[PDB]
Amino acid sequence: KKIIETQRAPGAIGPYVQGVDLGSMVFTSGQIPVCPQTGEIPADVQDQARLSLENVKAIVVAAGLSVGDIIKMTVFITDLNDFATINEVYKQFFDEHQATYPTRSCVQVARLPKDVKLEIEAIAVRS
Template sequence: MKVVFTPDAPAAIGPYSQGIVVNNMFYSSGQIPLTAEGNLIEGGIQEQTHQVFKNLQAVLQAANASLETVVKATVFIKNMDDFAAINEVYGQYFVEHKPARSCVEVARLPKDVLLEIEVIALVK
């Protein structure tokens, strides 16, 4: 088991890691729209979604994986009314490769952000 850490994504805000690699599979912790310095980005759901993908790309790279090797994504959103706007941004990152995905509305997310995404990916 290998713990994944990169300074290019926000550090964990609790007793967990950015991700773990086990048997050539990468399991990310949920990424929220914080900068690598830990600051919440300004803007609405689309800006927050772009920042989450920036963070995911950083932890995937640190794990020797990429968006192209993601097999499953789980999207947690604060408001299901944002589903279409999130999908618009999500589709910019998963163009031809479309991993399995779940999307659920939740009552609240850390730091009151609008979304959180976690992924499972094959390590190259």
């Protein structure tokens, strides 16, 4: 049960840690497209998708793991019109790390913290 803390993901606002490392398994919090330095949210969905993804990556790498060890994601979205765009980014993100795609759920919710267009949580394994 080790806590994960990285400056390459946005710092914890409220009463949660960025990640927890259980030994075999790493769980991230839901990541939103907040810039870890500036605290800013990009306006385009394609930039939001990339930034949530990077924020997930940061926590997983801080645990000593890679993109390729992510086995499950959930993508919470606010607008299905954004779906093909989010998918393209999500695909390029995995391809660039030469990593097979995780398992995945994807649901459109009513609203997300800070009115972002998406939120991504992950589960990675050590081997």
